[PDB]
Structure formats: C-alpha cells, structure tokens
Design a protein around this ligand. Structure first.
Ligand SMILES: [Zn+2]
Length: 302
C-alpha cells in the first residue's frame, strides 16, 4: 500500500525516463539515480505466459537497489517487445517478492536485446491456429514459433517509417540456454548431406529464405556464426507489412545438431553500410506437428 508506491514510483520514473506513462498501461529520488545487465535479457525470457514466477528464481540469485532497477528495465523491455500488459504484473510481482524475501532485511555472443529504432521495427506473424494440418504457427504467449522442417515460415516485418533503399534484413540463430550460447548453431550431418539444396544456401546453414534469388548467406570470419540476409523491400500494393519466407532445415530433436536444445532467432534491420537499425527475436521449435506441440505448451499455462 506504501511499499507498492515505492515500486510503482521507480517503474513510473523509468517509464517516464523513456517515452511512456503509467496510466497508458526523497529516498525515492535517491533510488532514481542509484539505478551483468545481460542477465535481464538473456537469462530471463519475459513473455505474456513466461515469467509466470520465474521472476522469483531470477531475483533469488541475488542489490535491493539492483532489484528495483531490474524491474524497471523489464518494463522498458516489456513495452519494447510490445508486451506492455506485463508492466501491470511486474509491479504486482515486485511488490510480493519484497514482502516475502527482502522486506525482513529492511524491517531492522550476439545480443538479443530488442530495439525498434528510428523506423519502429516490429515482427508480425500470421494467425494460423493449432489444427494438425498447420505447417507453421506462432505462440504470442510464449513468443515462440512452431514449424515443420523445410516448410514455409512467414515472418512479417512492420515499420513506423519506411527505411531507405539498400536496407537489409538479416536472420541469425543462437541457443536460448546460457550453457550453449557460445556454441554456433548449425545443421546435423544427415540434413547437412541431403539432396534438398536450393543452389544458394550453404549445406550447413539452418535458416534459409524462400523464393528470393537476391538472398545472401554469411559465415562470420571471426565468430563463425551463420547468417542469412535479404534486401528490405517496402510492403506490396495493398499490404501493410513485408513478408519474408524462412525455412528451418533441421529439427529441434536432431542429434548431430541442436540435439534437443531450444534456439532463438534474431532478426536485425541493417543499412547498406551494415549499421544496425533494429532488432527483434523469437524462440523456435522445429517439430513434426507444430499445432499439437503449440497447444500442449499453452495448455500448461494458467
Ligand atoms: Zn537435422
């Protein structure tokens, strides 16, 4: 009732420290200045369903200032990822955690960080359901894509402002887990050696693009990380978004490759000189029956 005020203060500050308002969604001011940041992005995966109470585990790791601050950045990151609703909860959680854990003490390696940038860069997805005949479906609640191997994956790009000609769109994959984040993601020997090649993609790259001769693939010479890039094109006549068709050419369960380890995909928006304009990411599971797998994860939620 007053402890809530201290949190909501800290957040509402951090809200207004950016271009955001509480309603849209002293020692107080001492903390407003006082405030391993990769923890906040990497180790957590904030998501409507996710962070159900994985927040508690994260804060248990660890200061009380860094706690109040931590929750501020979550809310920033929440609104960044278009997951504004969570700011409501993060405060509700933050209020509870203090009371339970901290209150007694008081009674006495590519970045996956989201940036919308100048152009207001967002990812859209078709809303395709979970019927067993779906090849490709996205869980907003899990911020997770479910698709079959070598099947079409529409990923929409959305922009506030049209970025100039020579802008490019690059996809890269990394492991969601910290213990695997340094290992480069690549295909498994079987799929690697398969008469499936489009004539363009390296045999070894997980992510391909479909129906685009202007595509281009990269093995970074210093990090050995695989990438695929295409030229950005503004929406076609009628549409309000750009649609790229990706393929995942190896399953999540494949031994010799991902070996049942979950991945993130990182879509970055670049200029011709390769300066970064924006970044967005989502989880991927490549499975046999995406519709079923999606439902099963979501059915587990509250
Ligand atoms: Zn494979």
């Amino acid at each position: 009732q007053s402890n809530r005020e201290l949190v909501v203060d800290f957040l509402s500050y951090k809200l207004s420290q950016k271009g955001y308002s509480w309603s849209q969604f002293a020692v107080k001011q001492a903390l407003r200045e006082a405030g391993a940041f990769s923890d906040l992005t990497s180790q957590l995966h904030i998501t409507p369903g996710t962070a159900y109470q994985s927040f508690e585990q994260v804060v248990n790791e660890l200061r009380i200032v860094a706690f109040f601050s931590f929750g501020g950045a979550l809310c920033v990151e929440s609104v960044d990822k278009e997951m504004q609703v969570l700011v409501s909860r993060i405060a509700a959680w933050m209020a509870t955690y203090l009371n339970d854990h901290l209150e007694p003490w008081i009674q006495e390696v590519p970045s996956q960080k989201t940036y919308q940038g100048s152009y207001g860069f967002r990812l859209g997805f078709l809303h395709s359901g979970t019927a067993k005949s779906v090849t490709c479906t996205y869980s907003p609640a899990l911020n997770k894509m479910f698709c079959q191997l070598a099947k079409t994956c529409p990923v929409q790009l959305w922009v506030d402002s049209t970025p100039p000609p020579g802008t490019r769109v690059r996809a890269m994959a990394i492991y969601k887990q910290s213990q695997h984040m340094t290992e480069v993601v690549r295909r498994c020997p079987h799929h690697e050696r398969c008469s499936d090649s489009d004539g363009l993609a390296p045999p070894q790259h997980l992510i391909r693009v479909e129906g685009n001769l202007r595509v281009e693939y990269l093995d970074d010479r210093n990090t050995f990380r695989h990438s695929v890039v295409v030229p950005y094109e503004p929406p076609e006549v009628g549409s309000d978004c750009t649609t790229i068709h990706y393929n995942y050419m190896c399953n999540s369960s494949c031994m010799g490759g991902m070996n049942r380890r979950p991945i993130l995909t990182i879509i970055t928006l670049e200029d011709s000189s390769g300066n970064l304009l924006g970044r967005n990411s989502f989880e991927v599971r490549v499975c046999a029956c995406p519709g079923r797998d999606r439902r099963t994860e979501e059915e587990n939620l509250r």
